């Protein structure tokens, strides 16, 4: 192996923030300059610290409650809210001391299938689900009912509608392509006198004949769309209070351990179903080669004969299949080598209705979720986590991986940075493979810093890893330098 | 071929015994593994670690000063008032359900499937759970619920005709030590397949009026394939902050001193982990593999006269087949194999049964930081300190050469060489041609050297050997440095 | 000549051990028997009865405020009545005519046929499984409910057993390797030589390991059989090596601390067979040899009877198994399980702190191992000849040898 | 519900064979002389496409997993499966 | 050549431990007359061991080991029990 | 089997054919104190 394994490497510490007027504390953190690969050391050493002060200065983080204040939650509920025979304040104390229960719901309800996953925010830089930021387990007066089929819904507040838009491509591509060539070259020759005489005989074949097959299905099955409410939403539990922790002071440590616990932003808007993908690739070659000869000659004589046969033949396929949405056994046989029959793709369908994966995402940044009626400060809070935003963006974004082999996809995970292969190659590189090539495509370097005004400019290298190299894929999709304006 | 020299076990002398605590009546003293017993030798009747009963002069700590706020009696926990009277047993005593949120409906649902192994602690040297480091059952006053994305399960009435799902584990409640956990429903599977063929026949002769003929056939295939296919049921991430330990972690915490004794770390190292999981994804893994190598030669000459004939053939075949989650009848059966059948069956099985794929984790020290507690830092000094040290005592690196690719483990004080074919030993073949492709893997940590002021170093060797035949080299961190 | 069992003279008497009202003698074993000899049978120690020669001192070891049961055994107050089989037997009725309460309120739940055997003991000898030091069906007043296990029905976990998880996993490992061989010559009055020989080598190794999930034992406030505690009661105090020795025979010289259940199956063909012939006449001679070891092997364990017979058998012939055999042999493993491998703790572990004498006893067994480990050894034993090597059992050292070489020490050929 | 199938195949095979046979002689001292040839190339390709683009809105997800799934061997879609779809 | 029906399978050997008559019979009775046993044959011998078992392997000790310390001449009584068992060794060839 | 011919000679055989089976059903092992006969 050609590796050297390389240890993650945060910064010198920041200078401490002065003590905040409302947490009493003070903070300091560490920027990754370099992330953890190839098993060197697994670091991640306490990123942030954090200390107690002495106060001398004025808060005012007590935002009134014209509701309920929940005795555990510190939510606000609405006075109305309290008695329905529900829990909003999240640990049932807003259903305490009531002298009746009056019921809206005048029928058992569901939740919509999977409603709870889209209440918890995105690292939309890798796509993963974090903590939880809205409460889909909140109705308010809610008890309108819905119907999927017969199934009768309870709708979240936070939710505008969610709805069972259906809809189903199938595509297909099948090619395939043959190939064959054949060459044959005989020869005989002769001569006799009354003495002498010659005999001779050369023949011959070169032979080839290749093979490809590409195949292609994709079934992209939508099941639901989902949008959340604009305005006025009831967040969750953990993420309100993780919030009201946050410094008034800019620290980018405690905004950046936000998103480590809640992601960056919220599904605003989705579009909730299944993907079926299959794709194979087969390429087959036999090739041959023939020589057969005779001499004789007689005056006295001498006879040489030859012969040499060469047959050579390869056969190299790759299959990937992709499942997204559904139910364990369906999703297993789906994920077997052979295509499925029509059986199989109908309970998947079925499935995939009560198990969605998300097929298209509208985000909002989560700053936009800090709302005055919720928090004190907000203003610096939002100010904050904006400019916590675009850091962290230029943090956790997989740029500062070093490059993979075997045109392997590095994956900042954490502050260690995995190599997800190809099918084909192995080893924690992407190195181990019996291939003589295969198509590097590039891979983007971080993009540099914004130099000056009237203008900033920033720039790109395509040389992180190098597009060429064993025959390379395509060059980098995006942007190779780019601006904007102070003003 | 390699030959093998035994060594029985020997641990070091002991150390003085560690002064009787005040509320444990309890002494204790360790041992170290001066060398573990190797492939051939005995074990050692001792252990690492000894106690013994003491009374002590001064009188216990008083339950009543944590938080300010309710201690459970004859157990760990500290509480926040709420969770005294909730309805739910919050410690081990149940006294924090005594002389009584308030009465939880909560327990209607079942914990969350594999609450219990994401709890546990993780040994790196040796790959096993440990104890509960979280506590997988504290629900922290929370009725939250997640969501079971496969409960969808066929039931018939016989009474008026129908065919009808379940509606039973709709949802789960989520341990308050469990941030998020998912139930996103994935498969991705790959597959790789690749044969190369050659074959050769040639034939020279030559005749003077003296005779020479010749005669050769050669022939070669390969095969490869490599199957991977995952299924997630679930995804989850353990909490950073305010994380509630086991009441077994929290007393054997409570029970470390706050002085550097590396018996009773060691021994909270060894009994609760070397690292506990942060995040991870469930549900299933199937791999195999097939390789495949066979060869075929013939020869013949022949001169005027005598006459002489060859032929060798091989055939060495290589099928590893894995399946982690599901059902143990279906494993053996997807084990054995590949179909329609039992792959449909064992993801039918993962709607009940899944295992953990992979997993993030983090050192046993670093728990601490995020405890409920408040700062404990003397204690995760030490807690690294002897992690530090553990990491290389118990190190399976410390194990015989394992030679044709063996994998060696401590347990105990003790070795084995898991050879993946023949004899065990630090030589393992008999079946084999000694021709066997094997690599070389660490030849373990020099101890620190003399050092200046800026300069101190650490060396290793690829193994004791070299690669075996012609083989792979190690990943080659060869050397390391100190800050002496 | 065929060898014999040998042992020491027996050593000097102890005195009366007061509160136990015994004397002890003990003797070292200093050949086994082997070749065929007269095979031992003999024991290591011998007890007499005494008046002792001096007052026992005050026995009761009271814990206190804590509930003394009819057991050797203290428990705490909230598992004085719980409902439950608290306290290691029924203890209790004259109490609880009040507070019934269950740790379990209103459920039906079942114990773990698992968990109830798990911490083994285990003797090194051999590595035998004994029935468990650890009490597993006491539940310290915790329901705690599992419904794991593959047969989808739910269990209450026995509080030694800290973790009992269900990790299914099946795997089956297969390698073929075969070489095989020819070689071929040929070369008034008159000379001729013909030879030929050929060569067959297969190296077959199949095996399959399905697991039933692990058990991890708990590493502080252990509650231990009855059995076991009086069992520790009962001990010299003097590091008398026989009467040790019979407390490690009884619960062996470590507990599995963590244990792996499940089945296993596991096969071997190994085929290696070569003929040659030599002939010729000069102006007849003739010269032959043939060579062949052929065997097969099958181990099954765990599951149940007729499955796993049936499956033992049909791998070992040449048949085509059927994917639904290895499905019921492979489910039956719930029903049956089999301890595949473990973590082993020295027993002394299992000694409470908080009984008399503890540490006196945990450092005699510590020595007592160490000699039950020496003079059990095989490394005493008379030479086997040839390829083979000392094999060891009870009462003879012998060796045997599939290499044409023969007898029970393999010296002829 | 809409149904784009497209099929698409080219063959060809070619032969090209070329030989030559030559002979002298000569009496009075005969003598006789003799030279043959014979040469072949042959090539032969195929292309084969098939792409198809099933797409359905409305009905129950299971019903348009089913129809839009694209038997080969009818290609417009089966008559039980597509009224199955049209009921849900 | 059918070798079921043929004389030339003779000489096997039998033994066979615990189970129910009927199944070590069957079994003794295939072999006497050269023929093979089925595979159904053997898991019902292994199903009936169940009513009727054998011991396979043994560790053994004398017998005087279970002579209890409270017995009134414990000791000689024991020690001429090891005087009688060294003498059956001498007894028989 | 070996044969050495020359019309010194010497003949050789040693042959067998073994079936060998367990069945185990359980472990069983007895006090050796307290016990009450
Ligand atoms: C140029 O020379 C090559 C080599 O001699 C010719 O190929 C040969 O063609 C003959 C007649 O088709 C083949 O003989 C046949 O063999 C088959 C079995 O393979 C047998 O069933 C038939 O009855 C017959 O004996 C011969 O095997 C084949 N040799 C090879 C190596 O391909 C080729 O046809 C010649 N081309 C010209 C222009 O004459
Ligand atoms: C697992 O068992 C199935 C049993 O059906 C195998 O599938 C059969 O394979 C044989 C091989 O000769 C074919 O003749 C049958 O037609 C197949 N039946 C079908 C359609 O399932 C399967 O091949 C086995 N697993 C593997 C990977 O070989
Ligand atoms: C071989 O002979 C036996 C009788 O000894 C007969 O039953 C059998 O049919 C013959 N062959 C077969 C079909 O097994
Ligand atoms: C001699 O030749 C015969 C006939 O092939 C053969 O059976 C025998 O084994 C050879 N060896 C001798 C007779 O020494
Ligand atoms: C923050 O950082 C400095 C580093 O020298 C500390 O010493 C000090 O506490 C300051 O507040
Ligand atoms: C502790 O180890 C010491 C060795 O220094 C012994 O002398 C003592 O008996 C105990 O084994
Ligand atoms: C030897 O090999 C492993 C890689 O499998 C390294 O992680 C480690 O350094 C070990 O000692
Ligand atoms: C020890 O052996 C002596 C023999 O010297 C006997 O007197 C006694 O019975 C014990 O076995
Ligand atoms: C531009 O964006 C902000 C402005 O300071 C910084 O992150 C950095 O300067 C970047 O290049
Ligand atoms: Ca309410
Ligand atoms: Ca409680
Ligand atoms: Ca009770």
């Known amino acids: 192996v050609t590796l050297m394994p390389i240890d993650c490497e945060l910064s010198s510490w920041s200078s401490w923030t002065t003590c905040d007027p409302c947490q009493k504390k003070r903070y300091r953190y560490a920027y990754l300059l370099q992330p953890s690969q190839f098993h060197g050391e697994p670091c991640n050493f306490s990123d942030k610290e954090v200390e107690d002060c002495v106060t001398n200065r004025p808060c005012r983080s007590q935002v009134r409650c014209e509701g309920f204040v929940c005795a555990q939650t510190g939510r606000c509920v609405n006075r109305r809210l309290l008695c329905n025979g529900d829990n909003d304040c999240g640990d049932q104390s807003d259903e305490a001391n009531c002298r009746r229960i009056y019921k809206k719901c005048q029928h058992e309800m569901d939740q919509y299938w999977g409603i709870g996953s889209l209440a918890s925010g995105i690292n939309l830089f890798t796509n993963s689900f974090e903590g939880p930021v809205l409460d889909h387990r909140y109705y308010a007066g809610g008890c309108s009912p819905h119907y999927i089929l017969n199934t009768r819904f309870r709708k979240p507040y936070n939710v505008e509608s969610y709805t069972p838009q259906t809809q189903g491509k199938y595509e297909f591509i099948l090619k395939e392509y043959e190939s064959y060539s054949d060459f044959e070259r005989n020869v005989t020759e002769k001569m006799a006198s009354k003495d002498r005489g010659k005999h001779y005989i050369r023949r011959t074949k070169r032979f080839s004949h290749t093979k490809s097959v590409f195949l292609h299905a994709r079934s992209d099955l939508e099941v639901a769309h989902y949008k959340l409410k604009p305005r006025s939403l009831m967040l969750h539990y953990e993420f309100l209070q993780r919030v009201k922790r946050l410094p008034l002071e800019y620290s980018y440590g405690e905004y950046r351990d936000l998103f480590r616990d809640f992601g960056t932003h919220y599904i605003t808007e989705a579009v909730l179903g299944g993907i079926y993908e299959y794709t194979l690739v087969m390429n087959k070659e036999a090739m041959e080669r023939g020589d057969y000869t005779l001499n004789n000659v007689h005056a006295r004589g001498i006879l040489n004969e030859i012969k040499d046969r060469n047959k050579r033949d390869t056969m190299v396929e790759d299959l990937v299949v992709l499942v997204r949405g559904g139910a364990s056994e369906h999703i297993t046989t789906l994920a077997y080598q052979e295509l499925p029959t029509a059986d199989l793709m109908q309970e998947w369908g079925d499935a995939v209705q009560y198990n969605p994966a998300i097929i298209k995402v509208k985000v909002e940044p989560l700053y936009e979720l800090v709302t005055a009626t919720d928090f004190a400060y907000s203003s610096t809070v939002r100010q904050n986590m904006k400019q916590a935003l675009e850091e962290f963006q230029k943090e956790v974004s997989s740029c500062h991986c070093a490059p993979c082999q075997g045109n392997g996809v590095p994956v900042l995970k954490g502050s260690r940075c995995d190599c997800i292969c190809p099918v084909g190659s192995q080893g924690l590189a992407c190195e181990v493979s019996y291939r003589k090539n295969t198509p590097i495509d590039g891979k983007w370097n971080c993009w540099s810093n914004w130099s000056s005004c009237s203008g900033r400019r920033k720039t790109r290298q395509r040389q992180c890893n190098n597009p060429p190299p064993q025959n390379g894929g395509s060059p980098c999709s995006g942007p190779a330098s780019e601006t904007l304006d102070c003003s | 071929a390699a030959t093998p020299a035994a060594v029985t076990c020997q641990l070091s002398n002991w150390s003085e015994w560690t002064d009787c605590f005040p509320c444990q009546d309890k002494k204790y003293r360790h041992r170290s593994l001066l060398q573990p017993n190797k492939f051939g030798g005995t074990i050692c009747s001792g252990d690492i670690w000894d106690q013994a009963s003491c009374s002590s002069s001064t009188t216990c700590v008083r339950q009543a000063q944590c938080g300010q706020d309710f201690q459970c009696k004859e157990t760990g926990r500290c509480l926040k008032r709420h969770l005294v009277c909730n309805g739910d047993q919050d410690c081990l005593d149940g006294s924090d359900e005594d002389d009584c949120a308030i009465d939880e409906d909560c327990s209607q649902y079942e914990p969350i499937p594999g609450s219990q192994k994401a709890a546990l602690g993780y040994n790196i040297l040796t790959q096993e759970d440990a104890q509960s480091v979280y506590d997988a059952s504290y629900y922290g006053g929370q009725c939250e619920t997640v969501y079971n994305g496969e409960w969808r399960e066929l039931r018939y009435d016989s009474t008026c005709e129908r065919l009808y799902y379940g509606d039973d584990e709709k949802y789960f409640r989520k341990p308050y030590n469990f941030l998020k956990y998912h139930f996103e429903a994935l498969a991705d599977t790959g597959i790789s397949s690749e044969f190369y063929d050659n074959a050769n026949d040639l034939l020279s002769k030559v005749k003077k009026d003296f005779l020479n003929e010749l005669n050769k056939y050669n022939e070669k295939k390969f095969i490869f394939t490599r199957i991977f296919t995952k299924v997630q049921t679930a995804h989850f991430k353990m909490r950073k902050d305010d994380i509630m330990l086991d009441e077994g972690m929290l007393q054997s915490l409570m029970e470390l001193p706050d002085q550097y004794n590396y018996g009773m770390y060691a021994k909270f190292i060894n009994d609760y982990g070397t690292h506990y999981i942060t995040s991870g994804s469930m549900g299933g893994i199937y791999e195999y593999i097939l390789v495949i190598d066979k060869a075929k030669m013939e020869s013949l000459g022949i001169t005027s006269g005598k006459t002489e004939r060859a032929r060798k053939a091989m055939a060495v075949e290589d099928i590893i087949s894995r399946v982690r989650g599901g059902s143990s009848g279906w494993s053996g059966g997807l084990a054995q194999n590949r179909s329609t059948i039992t792959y449909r069956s064992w993801g039918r099985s993962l709607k009940y049964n899944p295992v953990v794929i992979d997993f993030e984790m983090q050192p046993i020290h670093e728990v601490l930081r995020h405890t409920s507690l408040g700062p404990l830092e003397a204690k995760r000094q030490n807690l690294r300190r002897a992690l530090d040290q553990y990491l290389m005592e118990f190190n399976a690196c410390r194990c015989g050469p394992c030679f044709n690719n063996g994998v060696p483990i401590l347990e105990g004080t003790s070795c084995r060489c898991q050879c993946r074919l023949g004899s065990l030993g630090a030589a393992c073949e008999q079946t084999q041609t000694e021709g066997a492709k094997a690599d070389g893997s660490w030849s373990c940590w020099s101890s620190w050297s003399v050092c200046r002021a800026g300069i101190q170093e650490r060396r290793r060797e690829c193994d004791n050997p070299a690669p075996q035949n012609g083989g792979a080299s190690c990943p080659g961190r060869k050397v390391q440095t100190q800050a002496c | 000549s065929h060898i014999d069992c040998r042992m020491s003279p027996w050593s000097e008497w102890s005195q009366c051990d007061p509160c136990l009202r015994q004397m002890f003698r003990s003797r070292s074993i200093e050949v086994f028997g082997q070749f065929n000899g007269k095979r031992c049978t003999d024991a290591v120690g011998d007890r007499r009865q005494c008046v002792p020669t001096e007052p026992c001192e005050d026995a009761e070891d009271d814990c206190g405020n804590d509930f003394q049961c009819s057991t050797g055994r203290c428990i705490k107050m909230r598992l004085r009545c719980n409902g439950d089989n608290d306290c290691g037997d029924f203890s209790d009725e004259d109490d609880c005519e009040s507070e019934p309460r269950p740790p379990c309120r209103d459920r039906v739940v079942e114990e773990s046929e698992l968990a109830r055997t798990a911490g083994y003991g285990i003797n090194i000898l051999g590595m035998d499984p004994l029935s468990t030091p650890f009490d597993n069906e006491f539940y310290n007043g915790l329901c705690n409910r599992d419904r794991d296990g593959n047969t989808l029905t739910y269990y209450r976990r026995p509080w030694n057993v800290a973790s009992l998880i269900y990790e299914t996993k099946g795997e089956k490992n297969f390698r073929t390797e075969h070489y095989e061989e020819q070689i071929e010559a040929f070369k008034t009055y008159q000379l001729f030589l013909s030879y030929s020989s050929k060569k067959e080598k297969m190296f077959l190794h199949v095996k399959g390991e399905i697991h039933l999930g692990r058990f991890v034992m708990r590493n502080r406030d252990v509650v231990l059989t009855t059995t076991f505690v009086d069992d520790i009661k009962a001990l010299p105090t003097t590091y008398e090596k026989g009467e040790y020795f019979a407390f490690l025979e009884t619960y062996g010289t470590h507990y599995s601390s963590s244990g792996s259940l499940g089945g296993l199956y596991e096969l071997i063909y190994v085929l290696d067979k070569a003929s040659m012939k030599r002939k010729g006449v000069e102006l007849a001679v003739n010269i032959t040899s043939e060579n062949l070891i052929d065997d097969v092997v099958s181990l099954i364990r765990g599951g149940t009877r007729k499955y796993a017979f049936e499956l033992k058998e049909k791998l070992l012939r040449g048949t085509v198994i059927d994917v639904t055999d290895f499905v019921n042999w492979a489910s039956s493993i719930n029903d049956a399980p089999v301890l595949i491998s473990q973590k082993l703790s020295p027993i002394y572990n299992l000694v409470p702190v908080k009984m008399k004498n503890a540490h006196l006893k945990k450092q005699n067994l510590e020595r007592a191992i160490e000699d039950y480990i020496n003079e059990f050894s095989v490394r005493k034993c008379h030479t086997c000849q040839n390829g083979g090597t000392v094999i060891l059992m009870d009462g003879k050292c012998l060796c045997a040898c599939p290499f044409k070489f023969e007898g029970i020490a393999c010296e002829i050929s | ?88």
């Open chain 4, 1 to 88: 519900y809409r149904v784009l199938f497209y099929v698409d195949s080219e063959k060809l095979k070619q032969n090209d064979f070329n030989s030559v046979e030559e002979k002298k002689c000569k009496s009075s001292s005969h003598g006789c002389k003799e030279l043959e040839n014979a040469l072949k190339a042959a090539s032969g390709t195929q292309n084969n496409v098939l792409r198809g683009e099933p797409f359905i809105r409305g009905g129950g997800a299971g019903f348009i997993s089913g129809l839009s799934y694209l038997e080969l061997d009818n290609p417009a879609g089966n008559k039980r499966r597509y009224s199955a779809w049209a009921e849900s």
